[PDB]
Amino acid sequence: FEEPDFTALCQKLKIPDHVRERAWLTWEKVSSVDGVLKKKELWGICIFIAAVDLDEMSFTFTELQKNIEISVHKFFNLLKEIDTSTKVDNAMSRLLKKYDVLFALFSKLERTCELIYLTQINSALVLKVSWITFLLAKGEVLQMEDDLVISFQLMLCVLDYFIKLSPPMLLKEPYKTAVIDTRIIEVLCKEHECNIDEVANVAFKNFIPFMNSLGLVTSNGLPEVENLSKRYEEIYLKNKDLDARLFLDHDKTLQTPHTPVRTVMNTIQQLMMILNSASDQPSENLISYFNNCTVNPKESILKRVKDIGYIFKEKFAKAVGQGCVEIGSQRYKLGVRLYYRVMESMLKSEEERLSIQNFSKLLNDNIFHMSLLACALEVVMATYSRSTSSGTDLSFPWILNVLNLKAFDFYKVIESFIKAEGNLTREMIKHLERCEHRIMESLAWLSDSPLFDLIKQSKDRKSTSLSLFYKKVYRLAYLRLNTLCERLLSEHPELEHIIWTLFQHTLQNEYELMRDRHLDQIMMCSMYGICKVKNIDLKFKIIVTAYKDLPHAVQETFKRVLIKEEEYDSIIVFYNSVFMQRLKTNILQY
């Protein structure tokens, strides 16, 4: 069956035989299903799929792109059509993220250069050397591969270095009459809404040490452009990544309210407003409430903060880069500034309501403090990340594993936090609400979770935390169930309430099915399970396609579902083996 053009492409990418024969088998099963269908683009994608699942990348992703002449986003889009394995999805995800971040940074770099150098050692030269230098500097200090902020501050340091190297003649007027001194790193931090202390730490701890490892290749300040270019190529060929040097030629392979970096840099200043009066220590009023307690909690509170900042900036560095313990430090400080601030707002607001000053059960509750702290930290960590409406591994629920805090417990504080801090931006509020959504949809239903005891200790007839939670889950569950129903079942509106009854029945009387599973999986199975006993043609592929268009739905939710303990399959396999096993004698009634 193997068309020659395919075997040709396979050869140009040095594809091994097992990979060739699996790239082809994939092309067979894909053309077999139709709905997508030049046909060369799809071939390389099949090759790429084969070379990821088989752990045999004999080619760099840029090489593949050079051959099927596809754009990065286009490649990604087309891949969503194919029933690719989760492992491919991870691969393309990481690659998509890497590209977007790199593109943003490079765009920002090239944009800034045209405003520093009047156009014509010269501007074109420094752009090349700054970018490749940064490219190498990035790889040494950062282990994230998609952290916009630290990368950008790093890039600002690189830029700073080469502006001074530049003769002031070809510099534009702010910078020209400025290198004649250290005002350059200030001007940038002003022009780009960056903290001067954040940048200076990166320069001292990361950028400058790195440059000092380039002495053998630098003459007259300037590193050898070509030696670095070769040093980068060595790493590009190794990761089989994308050749990021190509941005310099505006290479086609890499062509596609505020551009991505200024966006995130501004929300950071928005956090600097909110905290422009909060010390990293309990204020005297905070200390008042402490002293006005039955048991003075100040000892346990100052210690918890110390203990957590240790586990934090360590874990931070484990994920961001070992040479970044100090930025983990200056992130955590911000969290503490917020944390103490909100705690003062809470206590004060609580005496306006309770007319007392002894808040001793509250202030000595260990779970309450960890909650409030994890929450202040999250606001901070999210302020520093690329907005997740494709986020990161520092994204929620990263902060929950650091503090060893159960998601349910974390959820209970969100509402009071938002209200206690009247200065949270709408975006921060919206992000916290989405955090609550994840706890509701899956996290609180994890195997080790207080929730299942609130449920067990309600299987009798004092339950109130359990009821407000269930009321919030239902709202989420029905809202999702309903947009799905209107899209897929206009012609049978009588089914919706029926499904919802089965959905409710499961969350309530079969909760031990949600254990380490996802709410939307119980939703999708409920639609299907009912549609079948009432003989409506609604196959899972249809259900699952509609599911993807939901606000924050991810493919892994239907591709990877817990069947037996430590056993993951598809939602269909889940439907038949487990979901129908427990609910057989309930869907009888319908």
Coordinates of C-alpha atoms in Angstrom, one line a residue:
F1 CA 0.0 0.0 0.0
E2 CA 2.9 2.3 0.8
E3 CA 2.9 5.2 -1.7
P4 CA 6.4 6.1 -2.9
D5 CA 6.2 9.7 -1.8
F6 CA 5.6 8.4 1.8
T7 CA 8.6 6.1 1.7
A8 CA 10.5 9.0 0.2
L9 CA 9.6 11.3 3.1
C10 CA 10.5 8.5 5.5
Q11 CA 14.0 8.4 4.1
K12 CA 14.6 12.1 4.2
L13 CA 14.0 12.0 7.9
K14 CA 16.1 8.9 8.4
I15 CA 13.1 7.0 9.8
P16 CA 13.9 3.5 11.1
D17 CA 11.9 0.6 9.7
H18 CA 9.7 0.0 12.7
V19 CA 8.8 3.7 12.8
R20 CA 8.1 3.8 9.0
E21 CA 5.8 0.8 9.3
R22 CA 4.0 2.3 12.2
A23 CA 3.7 5.7 10.6
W24 CA 2.1 3.9 7.7
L25 CA -0.2 1.8 9.8
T26 CA -1.4 5.1 11.4
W27 CA -2.0 6.7 8.0
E28 CA -4.2 3.6 7.2
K29 CA -6.3 3.9 10.3
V30 CA -6.7 7.6 9.9
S31 CA -7.8 7.7 6.3
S32 CA -10.1 4.8 7.3
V33 CA -12.2 7.0 9.5
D34 CA -12.4 10.2 7.3
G35 CA -13.6 13.6 8.3
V36 CA -10.3 15.4 8.0
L37 CA -9.3 15.0 4.3
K38 CA -2.0 17.8 -0.3
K39 CA -1.8 14.8 2.0
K40 CA 1.8 15.1 2.9
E41 CA 1.2 17.2 6.0
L42 CA -0.8 14.3 7.4
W43 CA 2.0 11.8 6.6
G44 CA 4.7 13.5 8.7
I45 CA 2.2 13.8 11.5
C46 CA 1.7 10.1 11.3
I47 CA 5.5 9.7 11.3
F48 CA 5.8 12.0 14.3
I49 CA 3.1 10.0 16.1
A50 CA 5.0 6.8 15.4
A51 CA 8.3 8.3 16.5
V52 CA 6.9 9.5 19.8
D53 CA 5.0 6.4 20.8
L54 CA 8.0 4.2 19.9
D55 CA 10.5 6.5 21.6
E56 CA 12.5 6.8 18.4
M57 CA 13.0 10.4 17.3
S58 CA 15.6 10.1 14.5
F59 CA 14.7 13.6 13.4
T60 CA 14.3 17.1 14.9
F61 CA 10.9 18.6 14.9
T62 CA 12.2 21.5 12.8
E63 CA 13.3 18.9 10.2
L64 CA 9.9 17.4 10.1
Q65 CA 8.4 20.9 9.7
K66 CA 10.9 21.7 6.9
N67 CA 9.7 18.7 4.9
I68 CA 5.9 18.8 5.2
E69 CA 6.0 22.7 5.1
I70 CA 3.6 23.1 8.0
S71 CA 3.2 25.8 10.7
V72 CA 3.5 24.9 14.4
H73 CA -0.1 25.8 15.3
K74 CA -1.3 24.2 12.1
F75 CA 0.5 20.9 12.9
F76 CA -1.0 21.1 16.4
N77 CA -4.5 21.7 15.1
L78 CA -4.4 18.7 12.7
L79 CA -3.1 16.4 15.4
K80 CA -6.2 17.0 17.5
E81 CA -8.3 15.3 14.8
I82 CA -6.3 12.0 15.0
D83 CA -7.0 9.6 17.9
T84 CA -3.5 10.1 19.2
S85 CA -2.2 8.6 22.4
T86 CA -2.0 10.7 25.6
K87 CA 1.8 10.4 25.4
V88 CA 1.8 12.1 22.0
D89 CA -0.6 14.7 23.4
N90 CA 2.0 15.5 26.2
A91 CA 4.7 15.6 23.6
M92 CA 2.9 18.1 21.3
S93 CA 1.7 20.1 24.4
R94 CA 5.2 20.7 25.7
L95 CA 6.3 21.5 22.2
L96 CA 3.4 23.9 21.6
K97 CA 4.2 25.7 24.9
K98 CA 7.9 25.8 24.1
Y99 CA 7.2 27.4 20.7
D100 CA 4.7 30.0 22.0
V101 CA 7.0 31.2 24.8
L102 CA 10.1 31.3 22.5
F103 CA 8.1 33.2 19.8
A104 CA 6.8 35.8 22.4
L105 CA 10.3 36.4 23.8
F106 CA 11.9 36.7 20.4
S107 CA 9.1 39.0 19.2
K108 CA 9.7 41.1 22.3
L109 CA 13.4 41.2 21.8
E110 CA 13.2 42.3 18.1
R111 CA 10.5 44.8 19.0
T112 CA 12.7 46.4 21.7
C113 CA 15.8 46.5 19.5
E114 CA 14.2 48.8 16.9
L115 CA 13.6 51.3 19.7
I116 CA 17.1 51.1 21.1
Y117 CA 19.1 51.2 17.8
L118 CA 18.3 53.7 15.1
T119 CA 18.4 51.5 11.9
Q120 CA 21.1 51.3 9.2
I121 CA 29.5 46.3 15.2
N122 CA 25.8 47.1 14.7
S123 CA 22.1 46.5 15.5
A124 CA 21.7 43.4 13.3
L125 CA 24.8 41.9 14.9
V126 CA 23.7 42.4 18.6
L127 CA 20.2 41.0 17.9
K128 CA 21.8 37.8 16.7
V129 CA 24.3 37.6 19.5
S130 CA 21.7 38.6 22.2
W131 CA 19.2 36.1 21.1
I132 CA 21.7 33.1 20.8
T133 CA 23.3 34.2 24.1
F134 CA 19.9 34.3 25.8
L135 CA 19.0 31.0 24.1
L136 CA 22.0 29.4 25.8
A137 CA 21.6 31.3 29.1
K138 CA 18.0 30.2 29.3
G139 CA 18.9 26.5 28.9
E140 CA 21.5 26.7 31.7
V141 CA 19.4 28.5 34.4
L142 CA 15.8 27.4 33.6
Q143 CA 14.4 23.9 33.7
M144 CA 10.8 25.0 33.1
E145 CA 11.0 25.5 29.3
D146 CA 7.9 27.7 29.4
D147 CA 8.3 30.3 32.2
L148 CA 7.7 33.6 30.6
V149 CA 8.7 36.0 33.5
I150 CA 12.1 34.7 34.6
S151 CA 13.0 34.1 30.9
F152 CA 12.1 37.7 30.1
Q153 CA 14.0 39.2 33.0
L154 CA 16.9 37.0 32.0
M155 CA 16.6 38.3 28.4
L156 CA 16.5 41.8 29.8
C157 CA 19.8 41.1 31.5
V158 CA 21.3 39.8 28.3
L159 CA 20.0 42.9 26.4
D160 CA 21.5 45.1 29.1
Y161 CA 24.9 43.6 28.6
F162 CA 25.1 44.1 24.8
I163 CA 23.7 47.7 24.9
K164 CA 26.8 48.8 26.9
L165 CA 29.0 47.0 24.5
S166 CA 27.4 49.0 21.7
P167 CA 29.0 52.3 20.7
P168 CA 26.5 55.1 21.8
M169 CA 26.5 56.4 18.2
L170 CA 24.0 53.8 16.9
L171 CA 21.9 53.9 20.1
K172 CA 18.6 55.8 20.2
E173 CA 18.4 58.9 22.4
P174 CA 17.1 57.6 25.7
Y175 CA 19.8 54.8 25.8
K176 CA 22.5 56.8 24.0
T177 CA 22.8 59.5 26.6
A178 CA 22.5 56.9 29.4
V179 CA 25.4 54.4 28.9
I180 CA 27.5 57.5 29.6
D181 CA 26.4 54.6 33.7
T182 CA 24.2 51.9 35.2
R183 CA 20.9 53.6 34.2
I184 CA 20.3 51.0 31.5
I185 CA 18.9 48.2 33.6
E186 CA 16.7 50.8 35.3
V187 CA 15.3 52.2 32.0
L188 CA 14.3 48.8 30.9
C189 CA 12.7 47.8 34.2
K190 CA 10.8 51.1 33.9
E191 CA 9.9 50.7 30.2
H192 CA 8.8 47.1 30.7
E193 CA 7.1 47.1 34.1
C194 CA 9.6 44.9 35.8
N195 CA 10.8 44.9 39.4
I196 CA 14.3 46.2 39.6
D197 CA 15.1 43.8 42.5
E198 CA 13.7 40.8 40.6
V199 CA 15.9 41.5 37.6
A200 CA 19.0 42.4 39.7
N201 CA 18.8 39.1 41.5
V202 CA 18.7 37.2 38.2
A203 CA 21.7 39.2 36.9
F204 CA 23.7 38.5 40.1
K205 CA 22.7 34.9 40.6
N206 CA 22.2 33.6 37.1
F207 CA 23.0 35.8 34.1
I208 CA 26.4 37.1 35.2
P209 CA 27.8 33.8 36.5
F210 CA 26.8 32.2 33.2
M211 CA 28.6 34.9 31.2
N212 CA 31.7 34.3 33.3
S213 CA 31.7 30.8 31.9
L214 CA 32.1 32.3 28.5
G215 CA 35.4 34.1 29.1
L216 CA 37.4 31.7 26.8
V217 CA 35.1 32.7 23.9
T218 CA 34.7 36.4 24.6
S219 CA 37.1 39.0 23.2
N220 CA 36.6 42.7 23.9
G221 CA 33.4 41.9 25.8
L222 CA 31.6 40.3 22.9
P223 CA 31.3 36.5 22.8
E224 CA 32.2 34.7 19.6
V225 CA 28.9 34.7 17.7
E226 CA 29.6 31.5 15.8
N227 CA 31.0 29.4 18.7
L228 CA 27.8 29.9 20.7
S229 CA 25.7 29.2 17.6
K230 CA 27.4 25.9 17.3
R231 CA 27.1 25.2 21.0
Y232 CA 23.3 25.8 20.7
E233 CA 23.0 23.6 17.6
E234 CA 24.6 20.7 19.6
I235 CA 21.7 21.0 22.1
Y236 CA 19.0 21.5 19.5
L237 CA 20.0 18.3 17.6
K238 CA 20.0 16.5 20.9
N239 CA 16.5 17.4 22.2
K240 CA 15.2 17.1 18.6
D241 CA 13.6 20.3 19.6
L242 CA 12.9 23.2 17.3
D243 CA 16.0 25.2 16.1
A244 CA 15.2 28.5 17.8
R245 CA 18.0 30.3 15.8
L246 CA 15.6 30.4 12.9
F247 CA 13.6 33.2 14.4
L248 CA 16.5 35.4 13.3
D249 CA 15.7 34.8 9.7
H250 CA 12.0 35.0 10.3
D251 CA 11.9 31.5 9.1
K252 CA 8.6 30.2 7.8
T253 CA 8.6 27.1 10.0
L254 CA 8.2 29.5 13.0
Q255 CA 5.8 32.1 11.5
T256 CA 2.2 31.9 12.7
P257 CA -5.1 43.5 24.5
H258 CA -1.4 43.3 25.2
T259 CA 1.4 41.2 23.8
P260 CA 2.1 38.1 26.1
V261 CA 5.0 39.6 28.2
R262 CA 3.6 43.0 29.0
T263 CA 0.3 41.3 29.9
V264 CA 1.9 39.2 32.6
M265 CA 4.3 41.9 33.7
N266 CA 1.4 44.3 34.3
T267 CA -0.6 41.9 36.5
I268 CA 2.6 41.6 38.5
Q269 CA 2.5 45.4 39.1
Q270 CA -1.2 44.9 40.0
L271 CA 0.0 42.6 42.8
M272 CA 2.6 45.2 43.8
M273 CA -0.2 47.7 44.3
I274 CA -2.3 45.4 46.5
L275 CA 0.8 44.7 48.7
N276 CA 2.3 48.2 48.8
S277 CA 1.9 48.4 52.6
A278 CA 2.1 44.8 53.7
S279 CA 5.2 43.9 55.7
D280 CA 6.6 40.4 55.6
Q281 CA 5.8 40.4 59.3
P282 CA 2.6 40.5 61.4
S283 CA 1.7 44.2 62.1
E284 CA 1.1 45.4 65.6
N285 CA -2.7 45.1 65.1
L286 CA -2.2 41.5 64.0
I287 CA -0.1 41.0 67.1
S288 CA -2.9 42.6 69.1
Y289 CA -5.3 39.8 68.0
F290 CA -2.6 37.3 68.8
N291 CA -2.2 38.7 72.4
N292 CA -6.0 38.9 72.8
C293 CA -6.2 35.2 72.3
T294 CA -6.9 32.4 74.9
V295 CA -3.9 30.5 73.6
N296 CA -1.4 32.9 72.0
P297 CA -1.0 31.6 68.5
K298 CA 1.9 33.8 67.4
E299 CA 4.5 31.1 68.2
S300 CA 2.9 28.4 66.0
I301 CA 2.2 31.0 63.2
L302 CA 5.7 32.4 62.8
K303 CA 7.1 28.9 62.9
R304 CA 4.7 27.5 60.3
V305 CA 5.7 30.4 57.9
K306 CA 9.4 29.6 58.5
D307 CA 8.9 25.9 58.0
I308 CA 6.9 26.3 54.8
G309 CA 9.2 28.8 53.2
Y310 CA 11.8 26.2 53.5
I311 CA 9.8 23.4 51.8
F312 CA 8.5 26.0 49.3
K313 CA 11.7 27.6 47.9
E314 CA 13.3 24.1 47.8
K315 CA 10.4 22.6 45.8
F316 CA 10.3 25.8 43.7
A317 CA 13.9 25.3 42.7
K318 CA 13.3 21.6 42.0
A319 CA 10.8 22.7 39.3
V320 CA 12.2 26.0 38.0
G321 CA 15.9 25.5 38.3
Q322 CA 18.4 24.8 41.1
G323 CA 20.0 28.1 40.5
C324 CA 16.7 29.8 41.3
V325 CA 16.3 29.2 45.0
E326 CA 16.4 32.9 45.6
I327 CA 13.6 33.8 43.2
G328 CA 11.6 31.1 44.9
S329 CA 12.5 33.0 48.0
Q330 CA 11.3 36.4 46.7
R331 CA 8.1 34.8 45.4
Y332 CA 7.3 33.2 48.8
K333 CA 7.9 36.5 50.6
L334 CA 5.2 38.1 48.5
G335 CA 2.9 35.3 49.5
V336 CA 3.6 35.9 53.1
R337 CA 3.0 39.7 52.7
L338 CA -0.4 38.9 51.2
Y339 CA -1.2 36.1 53.7
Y340 CA -0.7 38.3 56.8
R341 CA -2.6 41.1 55.1
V342 CA -5.7 39.1 54.4
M343 CA -5.5 37.6 57.9
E344 CA -5.8 41.1 59.3
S345 CA -8.7 41.9 57.1
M346 CA -10.4 38.7 58.2
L347 CA -10.0 39.1 62.0
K348 CA -11.0 42.7 61.9
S349 CA -14.1 42.0 59.7
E350 CA -14.9 39.2 62.2
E351 CA -15.0 41.5 65.2
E352 CA -17.3 43.9 63.3
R353 CA -19.6 40.9 63.2
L354 CA -19.0 39.0 66.4
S355 CA -18.1 41.9 68.7
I356 CA -15.2 40.0 70.3
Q357 CA -11.4 40.1 70.1
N358 CA -10.6 36.5 71.2
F359 CA -10.3 34.7 67.9
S360 CA -8.5 31.7 69.5
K361 CA -10.0 28.7 67.8
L362 CA -9.5 30.3 64.4
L363 CA -6.0 31.5 64.9
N364 CA -4.8 28.2 66.4
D365 CA -6.4 26.0 63.7
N366 CA -3.5 24.6 61.7
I367 CA -5.6 23.6 58.7
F368 CA -7.0 27.2 58.5
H369 CA -3.6 28.8 58.4
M370 CA -2.2 26.4 55.7
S371 CA -5.3 27.0 53.7
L372 CA -5.0 30.8 53.9
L373 CA -1.3 30.6 53.1
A374 CA -1.7 28.2 50.1
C375 CA -4.3 30.6 48.8
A376 CA -2.1 33.7 49.1
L377 CA 0.7 31.8 47.4
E378 CA -1.6 30.6 44.6
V379 CA -2.6 34.2 43.8
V380 CA 1.1 35.0 43.6
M381 CA 2.2 31.9 41.6
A382 CA -0.7 32.5 39.1
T383 CA 0.2 36.2 38.9
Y384 CA 3.6 35.2 37.7
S385 CA 2.5 32.5 35.3
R386 CA 1.1 32.8 31.8
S387 CA -2.6 33.2 32.3
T388 CA -4.4 29.9 32.0
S389 CA -7.6 31.3 30.4
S390 CA -1.8 25.6 28.3
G391 CA -0.5 26.6 31.7
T392 CA 2.4 25.0 33.5
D393 CA 3.6 22.5 36.2
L394 CA 3.7 25.4 38.8
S395 CA 0.0 25.7 38.0
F396 CA -2.6 24.8 40.6
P397 CA -2.6 22.2 42.1
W398 CA 1.2 22.6 42.4
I399 CA 0.9 24.6 45.6
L400 CA -1.2 21.9 47.3
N401 CA 1.4 19.2 47.1
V402 CA 4.1 21.6 48.4
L403 CA 2.2 22.4 51.6
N404 CA 0.7 18.9 51.8
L405 CA -2.8 20.4 51.9
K406 CA -5.9 18.5 50.9
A407 CA -7.9 20.2 48.2
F408 CA -11.3 20.1 50.0
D409 CA -9.7 22.0 53.0
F410 CA -8.2 24.5 50.5
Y411 CA -11.6 25.0 48.9
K412 CA -13.3 26.1 52.1
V413 CA -11.1 29.2 52.3
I414 CA -11.5 30.5 48.8
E415 CA -14.8 32.3 49.4
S416 CA -13.7 34.1 52.6
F417 CA -10.3 34.9 50.9
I418 CA -11.9 36.7 47.9
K419 CA -14.1 38.6 50.3
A420 CA -11.4 39.4 52.8
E421 CA -9.2 40.8 50.0
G422 CA -11.3 43.5 48.3
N423 CA -8.4 44.4 46.0
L424 CA -8.1 41.1 44.1
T425 CA -8.4 41.9 40.4
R426 CA -11.2 40.3 38.4
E427 CA -8.7 37.9 36.8
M428 CA -7.4 36.7 40.2
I429 CA -10.9 36.2 41.3
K430 CA -11.7 34.3 38.1
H431 CA -8.6 32.2 38.5
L432 CA -9.4 31.2 42.1
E433 CA -13.0 30.3 41.0
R434 CA -11.5 28.0 38.4
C435 CA -9.3 26.5 41.2
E436 CA -12.5 25.8 43.1
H437 CA -13.9 24.3 39.9
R438 CA -11.1 21.7 39.7
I439 CA -11.4 20.8 43.4
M440 CA -15.1 20.3 42.8
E441 CA -14.7 18.4 39.5
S442 CA -11.9 16.0 40.6
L443 CA -9.4 17.1 43.3
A444 CA -11.7 16.8 46.3
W445 CA -12.6 13.3 45.0
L446 CA -9.1 12.0 45.2
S447 CA -8.6 8.8 47.3
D448 CA -7.0 10.5 50.2
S449 CA -9.5 13.2 50.9
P450 CA -11.7 14.3 53.9
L451 CA -14.7 14.4 51.7
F452 CA -15.3 10.7 51.9
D453 CA -15.6 10.9 55.6
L454 CA -18.0 13.8 55.5
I455 CA -20.0 11.5 53.2
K456 CA -19.6 8.4 55.4
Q457 CA -20.5 10.4 58.6
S458 CA -23.7 11.6 56.8
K459 CA -24.8 8.1 56.0
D460 CA -27.1 8.0 59.0
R461 CA -29.7 10.8 58.5
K462 CA -24.7 17.3 61.5
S463 CA -23.8 17.7 57.9
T464 CA -23.4 21.3 56.6
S465 CA -20.0 21.6 55.0
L466 CA -21.0 18.5 53.0
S467 CA -24.2 20.2 51.8
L468 CA -22.8 23.5 50.6
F469 CA -20.2 21.5 48.7
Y470 CA -22.8 19.3 47.0
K471 CA -24.8 22.3 46.1
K472 CA -21.8 23.8 44.3
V473 CA -20.9 20.5 42.5
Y474 CA -24.5 20.2 41.3
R475 CA -24.4 23.8 39.9
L476 CA -21.2 22.9 38.0
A477 CA -22.5 19.5 36.9
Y478 CA -25.9 20.8 35.7
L479 CA -24.4 23.8 33.9
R480 CA -22.1 21.5 32.0
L481 CA -24.7 18.8 31.4
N482 CA -27.1 21.4 30.0
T483 CA -24.9 23.0 27.4
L484 CA -24.1 19.5 26.3
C485 CA -27.8 18.6 26.1
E486 CA -28.8 21.6 24.1
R487 CA -26.1 21.0 21.5
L488 CA -26.5 17.2 21.2
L489 CA -30.1 16.6 22.2
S490 CA -32.4 19.4 20.8
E491 CA -34.7 16.7 19.4
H492 CA -35.0 14.9 22.7
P493 CA -35.3 17.5 25.5
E494 CA -37.2 15.0 27.6
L495 CA -33.9 13.1 28.2
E496 CA -32.0 15.9 30.0
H497 CA -33.9 15.7 33.3
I498 CA -33.7 11.9 33.1
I499 CA -29.9 12.0 32.7
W500 CA -29.7 14.5 35.6
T501 CA -31.6 12.2 37.9
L502 CA -29.1 9.4 37.1
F503 CA -26.2 11.9 37.5
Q504 CA -27.5 13.0 40.9
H505 CA -28.2 9.4 41.9
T506 CA -24.5 8.5 41.2
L507 CA -22.9 11.5 43.0
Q508 CA -25.1 10.7 46.0
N509 CA -25.6 7.0 46.2
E510 CA -22.6 5.8 44.2
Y511 CA -20.0 8.4 45.2
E512 CA -17.4 5.7 45.5
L513 CA -17.3 5.8 41.7
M514 CA -16.0 9.3 41.7
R515 CA -13.0 8.1 43.7
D516 CA -9.9 9.4 41.8
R517 CA -12.1 10.1 38.8
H518 CA -13.6 13.2 37.1
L519 CA -17.1 14.8 37.4
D520 CA -17.3 15.2 33.6
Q521 CA -16.7 11.4 33.2
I522 CA -19.7 10.7 35.3
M523 CA -21.6 13.3 33.2
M524 CA -20.6 11.8 29.8
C525 CA -21.4 8.3 31.0
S526 CA -24.8 9.4 32.2
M527 CA -25.8 10.9 28.9
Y528 CA -24.7 7.7 27.1
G529 CA -26.2 5.3 29.6
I530 CA -29.6 6.9 29.4
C531 CA -29.7 7.5 25.7
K532 CA -29.1 3.8 25.2
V533 CA -32.0 2.5 27.4
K534 CA -34.2 4.9 25.4
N535 CA -32.8 3.9 22.0
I536 CA -31.4 7.2 20.8
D537 CA -28.4 7.2 18.5
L538 CA -25.8 9.0 20.6
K539 CA -22.4 7.3 20.3
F540 CA -19.5 8.3 22.5
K541 CA -17.4 9.9 19.7
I542 CA -20.2 12.4 19.3
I543 CA -20.5 13.0 23.1
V544 CA -16.7 13.3 23.4
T545 CA -16.4 15.8 20.4
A546 CA -18.9 18.1 22.0
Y547 CA -17.0 17.7 25.3
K548 CA -13.8 19.2 23.9
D549 CA -15.5 22.5 23.2
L550 CA -16.4 23.0 26.9
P551 CA -14.6 26.0 28.4
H552 CA -11.8 24.1 30.1
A553 CA -12.2 20.5 29.1
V554 CA -9.1 18.4 28.3
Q555 CA -8.8 15.3 26.1
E556 CA -7.1 13.2 28.8
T557 CA -10.5 13.2 30.6
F558 CA -12.0 10.8 28.1
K559 CA -8.7 9.2 26.8
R560 CA -7.5 8.2 30.3
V561 CA -10.0 7.0 32.8
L562 CA -9.5 4.8 35.9
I563 CA -11.0 1.4 35.4
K564 CA -9.4 -0.7 38.2
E565 CA -6.8 0.6 40.7
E566 CA -3.8 1.9 38.8
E567 CA -5.4 0.8 35.5
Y568 CA -6.3 3.5 33.0
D569 CA -8.3 3.2 29.8
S570 CA -10.9 5.1 27.7
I571 CA -14.2 6.4 28.9
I572 CA -16.0 3.8 26.7
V573 CA -14.1 1.0 28.4
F574 CA -15.0 2.7 31.6
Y575 CA -18.7 2.9 30.6
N576 CA -19.0 -0.8 30.0
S577 CA -16.9 -2.4 32.8
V578 CA -17.5 -0.1 35.8
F579 CA -20.1 2.6 35.2
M580 CA -22.7 0.0 34.0
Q581 CA -21.7 -2.6 36.6
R582 CA -22.8 -0.4 39.5
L583 CA -25.8 1.2 37.8
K584 CA -27.2 -1.7 35.8
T585 CA -30.1 -2.2 38.3
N586 CA -30.8 1.5 38.3
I587 CA -31.0 2.4 34.6
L588 CA -33.6 -0.4 34.5
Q589 CA -36.3 2.1 35.5
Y590 CA -35.9 4.1 32.3

